[PDB]
Amino acid sequence: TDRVSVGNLRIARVLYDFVNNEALPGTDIDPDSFWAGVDKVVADLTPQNQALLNARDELQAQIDKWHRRRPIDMDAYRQFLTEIGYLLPEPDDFTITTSGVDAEITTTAGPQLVVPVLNARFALNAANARWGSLYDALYGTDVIPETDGAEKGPTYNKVRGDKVIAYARKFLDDSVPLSSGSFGDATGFTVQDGQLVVALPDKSTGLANPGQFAGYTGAAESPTSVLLINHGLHIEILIDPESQVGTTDRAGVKDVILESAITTIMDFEDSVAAVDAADKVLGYRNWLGLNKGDLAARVLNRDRNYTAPGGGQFTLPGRSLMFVRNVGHLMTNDAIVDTDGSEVFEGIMDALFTGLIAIHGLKASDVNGPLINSRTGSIYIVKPKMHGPAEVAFTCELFSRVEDVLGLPQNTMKIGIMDEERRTTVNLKACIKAAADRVVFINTGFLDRTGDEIHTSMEAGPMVRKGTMKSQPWILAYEDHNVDAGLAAGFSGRAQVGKGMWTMTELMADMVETKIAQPRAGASTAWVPSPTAATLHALHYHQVDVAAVQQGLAGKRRATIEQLLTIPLAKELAWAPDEIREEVDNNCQSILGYVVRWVDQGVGASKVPDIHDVALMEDRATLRISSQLLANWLRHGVITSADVRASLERMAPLVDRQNAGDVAYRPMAPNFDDSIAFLAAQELILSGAQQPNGYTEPILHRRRREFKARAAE
Numbered sequence: 279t280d281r282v283s284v285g286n287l288r289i290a291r292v293l294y295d296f297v298n299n300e301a302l303p304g305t306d307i308d309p310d311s312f313w314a315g316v317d318k319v320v321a322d323l324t325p326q327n328q329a330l331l332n333a334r335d336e337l338q339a340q341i342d343k344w345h346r347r348r349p350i351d352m353d354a355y356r357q358f359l360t361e362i363g364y365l366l367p368e369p370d371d372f373t374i375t376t377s378g379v380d381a382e383i384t385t386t387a388g389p390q391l392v393v394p395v396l397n398a399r400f401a402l403n404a405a406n407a408r409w410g411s412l413y414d415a416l417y418g419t420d421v422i423p424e425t426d427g428a429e430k431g432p433t434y435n436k437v438r439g440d441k442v443i444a445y446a447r448k449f450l451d452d453s454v455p456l457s458s459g460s461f462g463d464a465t466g467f468t469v470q471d472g473q474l475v476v477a478l479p480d481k482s483t484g485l486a487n488p489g490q491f492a493g494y495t496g497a498a499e500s501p502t503s504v505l506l507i508n509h510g511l512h513i514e515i516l517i518d519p520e521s522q523v524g525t526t527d528r529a530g531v532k533d534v535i536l537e538s539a540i541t542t543i544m545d546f547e548d549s550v551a552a553v554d555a556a557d558k559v560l561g562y563r564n565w566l567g568l569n570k571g572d573l574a575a576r577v578l579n580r581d582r583n584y585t586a587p588g589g590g591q592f593t594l595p596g597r598s599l600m601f602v603r604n605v606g607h608l609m610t611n612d613a614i615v616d617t618d619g620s621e622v623f624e625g626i627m628d629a630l631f632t633g634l635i636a637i638h639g640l641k642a643s644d645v646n647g648p649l650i651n652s653r654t655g656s657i658y659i660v661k662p663k664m665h666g667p668a669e670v671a672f673t674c675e676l677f678s679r680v681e682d683v684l685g686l687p688q689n690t691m692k693i694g695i696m697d698e699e700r701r702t703t704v705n706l707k708a709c710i711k712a713a714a715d716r717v718v719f720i721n722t723g724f725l726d727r728t729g730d731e732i733h734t735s736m737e738a739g740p741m742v743r744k745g746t747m748k749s750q751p752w753i754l755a756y757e758d759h760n761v762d763a764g765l766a767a768g769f770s771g772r773a774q775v776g777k778g779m780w781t782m783t784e785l786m787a788d789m790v791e792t793k794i795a796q797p798r799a800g801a802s803t804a805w806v807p808s809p810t811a812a813t814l815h816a817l818h819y820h821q822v823d824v825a826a827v828q829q830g831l832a833g834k835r836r837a838t839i840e841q842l843l844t845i846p847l848a849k850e851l852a853w854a855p856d857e858i859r860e861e862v863d864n865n866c867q868s869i870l871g872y873v874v875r876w877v878d879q880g881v882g883a884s885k886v887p888d889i890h891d892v893a894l895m896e897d898r899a900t901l902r903i904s905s906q907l908l909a910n911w912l913r914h915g916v917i918t919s920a921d922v923r924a925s926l927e928r929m930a931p932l933v934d935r936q937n938a939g940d941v942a943y944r945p946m947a948p949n950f951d952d953s954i955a956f957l958a959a960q961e962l963i964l965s966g967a968q969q970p971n972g973y974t975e976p977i978l979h980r981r982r983r984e985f986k987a988r989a990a991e
């Protein structure tokens with residue numbers, strides 16, 4: 279084979295070479311020591327990693343049997359969950375003690391981007407998306423309707439531009455109010471005595487609250503830009519009377535720039551396809567470039583310089599503070615195998631390598647690269663798919679052991695707890711407590727959590743449709759319970775409380791209209807799928823004072839355990855055959871749509887047309903929910919495997935047409951049984967009920983390396 283033997287490890291050569299020649303130099307960690315560290319950590323933590331995975335199966339096996347042996351009695355259901363150790367007791371009240379955390383996280387509320395780390399240009403754009411032009415965001419999207427001669431065309435539409443300008447002016451009025459008059463009638467800006475002064479046609483005024491003036495560039499008598507702050511977020515008015523847009527503008531204004539994506543999550547998990555050592559190195563290679571601060575295709579933006587209202591120079595971050603999202607506890611990867619040939623656990627590998635690489639982001643020099651990520655010295659790892667408090671404790675112990683190998687102070691590696699499995703939801707307080715000195719983030723989502731919901735209660739009966747799930751009692755309790763737990767553990771001012779991703783990348787008007795609900799619910803952050811979306815979602819943090827919302831929610835217990843445990847069973851004869859048919863086709867094409875690009879092209883995140891040609895950018899969770907739903911309906915006789923195959927066959931050509939604009943694409947229809955993508959989609963459904971916690975990675979990872987194998991002959 280082509281591996282390097284170290285202790286019990288057989289490291290893939292490409293990985294070994296990458297760590298030694300690219301990752302290690304500059305960290306002052308001795309190579310041989312590092313690799314012995316890896317051998318040690320892997321040997322020491324693998325058994326516990328395995329025991330936890332076995333605990334999941336044992337619990338699920340018990341719940342399965344419980345449902346088979348029986349209108350649910352909730353007292354008995356609950357007592358049973360307590361008996362098997364699924365429902366643990368709730369700890370007393372406490373406050374997290376996590377320290378050395380950047381201000382982006384402790385204090386600032388705002389958008390958070392997620393991006394596939396394997397895609398360097400996407401990753402590049404995300405990092406630079408800390409600052410984004412509101413004009414570009416408004417003009418380029420449907421937030422401004424195209425109706426009244428404001429349509430987009432191959433050239434700039436001045437009528438549309440004026441609407442953009444008016445929209446921005448009104449934003450300024452709502453966010454940084456003048457003590458009298460509107461920004462719409464502004465004629466110019468001057469800095470007079472460390473104060474911003476705004477010229478109107480008939481007078482001059484300052485800010486209703488002068489403290490919102492945070493700086494400027496250029497001469498104080500005629501600034502090239504004015505920097506403003508609201509709710510901890512910065513607004514920059516660019517002033518340039520001789521630019522084209524400036525010439526038409528009443529105050530010479532050229533653009534309004536918003537501090538947008540305050541933090542970004544570089545993703546190694548559900549948005550990327552990485553099934554082997556070659557894929558993993560590409561991943562780690564981009565993350566290195568980002569932390570070194572030298573990755574380019576167009577560079578990483580440098581920090582922005584301003585003149586304080588007083589008179590000195592200061593510097594504001596120009597990049598989005600980066601987190602990394604490791605894979606979770608389940609999967610193994612062939613990047614490392616042991617002597618007998620067993621693949622090493624992928625999450626353990628991610629903590630070591632993504633942690634090692636992140637050392638470079640803690641300082642600027644020749645050997646570490648020019649740009650700094652964390653200014654406080656933290657490495658931020660989001661850890662997905664944890665089930666309960668013991669799996670959290672294990673993560674902390676892993677990070678603790680990784681810190682020792684890497685020579686870092688204890689608690690350097692912070693953890694972001696994704697709350698997307700049921701056993702975490704109902705034990706959330708205990709999960710946070712288990713990370714009380716490392717936690718900087720909790721969040722919620724729809725697709726994975728609902729996937730787990732369906733899998734856990736697979737045997738209980740047919741579940742409601744996917745669309746119906748969004749409004750079920752359990753999920754509403756789950757959303758509120760998340761925020762409550764976080765606030766009760768002292769998160770406001772200390773850690774992020776996040777909500778889920780907006781997936782409809784083209785429906786920006788809808789996003790601006792409805793996504794405001796998340797800050798209003800007290801989320802200090804929420805996920806956006808693009809830099810444009812980050813900019814538009816930032817408007818919400820200007821309209822909503824999240825700090826104040828979180829304060830008003832304090833001490834409230836809005837979710838009962840009974841609500842959390844309400845299984846989304848369908849009622850009697852809830853559906854007409856056309857409705858069943860609609861739902862089946864829907865899920866079949868969401869699986870096909872996502873799966874063809876995963877297996878054939880190693881893409882896990884992209885604008886995928888849904889059954890009604892709406893463009894969604896979902897991650898791999900879309901497979902979990904969809905497949906678990908179909909498997910649930912199969913198992914209870916709502917549908918048949920014939921219906922499923924016939925649906926998949928009906929939807930395959932449609933997916934084929936929706937990818938016409940693509941060169942690399944290879945149709946699935948009409949030779950279905952020779953498409954590895956098509957067979958994967960079909961396996962995901964017919965084998966769905968048998969997968970551990972309904973996870974799709976085992977089948978998906980296998981099919982992708984099958985496709986890659988066929989490519990190699």
Ligand SMILES: Cc1c(-c2ccc(F)cc2)n[nH]c1N
Binds near residue numbers: 392393549
């Ligand atoms: C994180 C996520 C995404 C996603 C992933 C990568 C991107 F670049 C844009 C969105 N879709 N759905 C979820 N839950």
Ligand SMILES: [Mg+2]
Binds near residue numbers: 899
């Ligand atoms: Mg997930």
